[PDB]
Amino acid sequence: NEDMPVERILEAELAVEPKTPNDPVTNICQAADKQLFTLVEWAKRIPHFSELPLDDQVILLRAGWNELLIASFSHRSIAVKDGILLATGLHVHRNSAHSAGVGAIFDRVLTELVSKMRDMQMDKTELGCLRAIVLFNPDSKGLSNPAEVEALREKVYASLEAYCKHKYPEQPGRFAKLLLRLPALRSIGLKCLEHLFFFKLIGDTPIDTFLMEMLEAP
C-alpha cells in the first residue's frame, strides 16, 4: 500500500519549496537554471529514486526536467493572479509575455495549469505525486531496465489514489481529475522546449550553465 509514502513525497516538495535583467524570457531562463539544482535535490528526496542506476537517474531527470519545472512554478503561481511567480521572487505578467511574443504558450500555462490547479485547490502532496509520476517515466530512451521505473510509477498511482480517497472522500474522481492534468503538461512542456531551442539558437537570450547542459546532448 505505502511502498511509496505520500508523506515522504510531500516532504521532498517542502524540502525544496519555501513559503509564500529585464527580458521576461531571460528572467524565466535564469529561474530555470537555479531550479535545475533544486530539482535534482527534490528528485533524490523521492522514495527509491536514488536506488536506480546513476545513468538512469540522469536519463529520467534529463527527460522530465521541463514538465517538472513547469508543474512546480504553475503551483506556486496559484495565488499570483493573471501572471506567473518565479523562484527568483520575480513575477512575469500575461501582457509582458505577449510583448516577448511568447503570449500563446504563456496563456496555455495560466489556463490549462495554474487556473485548473487553483480551481480544484490542488495540494502539495498531489503536486509532489504528479511530479513523481512525471519523474518515473519508463518510456525514456536508453534506460537500463524500464520495468523498475514503470513499477515505481505504478507505486505512485496507488499511493496518490489512496491519499485522494482518504483526504477527499467527497470528491470521488479527484485522482482522475489530477491525472488528466498530465496531458496538458506534456503538451505545454513540449512547446516550451521548442521555444527554448529557438531562443538558444538566436543567441540573443542568455542561457546559463545547467539550462544549457539540458538543451545540449549529454
Binding site: 489556463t111 490549462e112 485548473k116 505504478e154 498511482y157 496507488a158 489514489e161 470521488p172 474522481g173 485522482f175 482522475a176 481529475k177 491525472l179 488528466l180 498530465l182 496531458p183 496538458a184 506534456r186 503538451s187
Partner: protein, 250 residues
C-alpha cells in the same frame, strides 16, 4: 466498519448505468461496421510520407475520411450534455477531439496477426501505408497505441466513455461553458471508474494505466495538425474534402 468499509471500488451507481447505456449506444451506432468488421475487412493493395505524400494511398483515405469525421460528429450529437452546449463552445470541443476519437477508433481495430489497423471499419492499412499516405510519423504513433491498447481488452463501453472524456476537455482554447463542460467530464469519468471496477480487468493499475493513454491521443492530435500543414504545402487544397478542411483548417 469492515462491512461499511467493504463498499470500496464501487460499481455504476444507477444513473451511471443510464449514462453508460446512452453513450455505449451512441458509440455503437456511430462505430460504422458493428459486430462484422473482421468479416467486412477490405485489405488495401500493397501501394506505399515523413513531406513526399503518396497520392494513391492519400486518395483512398480522403475517400473514407468524409463519413469518418461525420460519425465523430453524430456520436457527440447523441450525448445529451453535449447537445445542451452553445454553437461556438461545441464546435471548439468537436475540433479538438476529432482526430483523438478517430485515432482511438482506428487503434482499437488493430490485429497483431496481420499487423493492420482498420480505417472506418472497411479498409485495413499497414504501418507503411498509413505513413506514406500523408500521416507520416503519426502512423507509428497510432499503430503503437493499437499494440498498447490490445493488452487492455477494451470493450464497447470503455471506448464510448474514453471518447466522451476526450470530448469534454475544459482545456481547449476559447470556452465559455467551462465548468459546465468540466462537470460533464467529471460525471462521465466517475461512471467510467465504476464500470472499470465492475469489469474487473486481469490488469493491476488499469484505471490510471488507461487514463495515461489520453496523453498519447492528445499528442496524436497535435502531430496531426503539424502533419496537415506539411500536407497543405505538398498539395492541392482541392484534394482535401470540405469537411476535413472545416475541422482542421484553423
Amino acid at each position: 466498519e469492515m462491512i461499511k468499509s467493504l463498499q470500496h471500488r464501487p460499481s455504476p451507481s444507477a444513473e451511471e448505468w443510464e449514462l453508460i447505456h446512452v453513450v455505449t449506444e451512441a458509440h455503437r451506432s456511430t462505430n460504422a461496421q458493428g459486430s462484422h468488421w473482421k468479416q467486412k475487412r477490405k485489405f488495401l493493395p500493397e501501394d506505399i510520407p515523413d513531406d513526399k505524400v503518396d497520392l494513391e494511398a492519400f486518395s483512398e483515405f480522403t475517400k473514407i475520411i468524409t463519413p469518418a469525421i461525420t460519425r465523430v460528429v453524430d456520436f457527440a450529437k447523441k450525448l445529451p450534455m453535449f447537445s445542451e452546449l452553445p454553437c461556438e463552445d461545441q464546435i471548439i470541443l468537436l475540433k479538438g477531439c476529432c482526430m483523438e476519437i478517430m485515432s482511438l477508433r482506428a487503434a482499437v481495430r488493430y490485429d497483431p496477426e496481420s499487423e493492420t489497423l482498420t480505417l472506418s471499419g472497411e479498409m485495413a492499412v499497414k504501418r507503411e501505408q498509413l505513413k506514406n499516405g500523408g500521416l507520416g510519423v503519426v502512423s507509428d504513433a497510432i499503430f503503437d497505441l493499437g499494440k498498447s491498447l490490445s493488452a487492455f481488452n477494451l470493450d464497447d463501453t470503455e471506448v464510448a466513455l474514453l471518447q466522451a472524456v476526450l470530448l469534454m476537455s475544459s482545456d481547449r482554447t476559447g470556452l465559455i461553458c467551462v465548468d459546465k463542460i468540466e462537470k460533464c467530464q467529471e460525471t462521465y469519468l466517475l461512471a467510467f471508474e465504476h464500470y472499470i471496477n465492475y469489469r474487473k480487468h486481469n490488469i493491476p493499475h488499469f484505471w490510471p494505466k488507461l487514463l495515461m493513454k489520453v496523453t498519447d491521443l492528445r499528442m496524436i492530435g497535435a502531430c496531426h495538425a503539424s502533419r496537415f500543414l506539411h500536407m497543405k504545402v505538398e498539395c492541392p487544397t482541392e484534394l482535401f474534402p470540405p469537411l476535413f478542411l472545416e475541422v482542421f483548417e484553423d
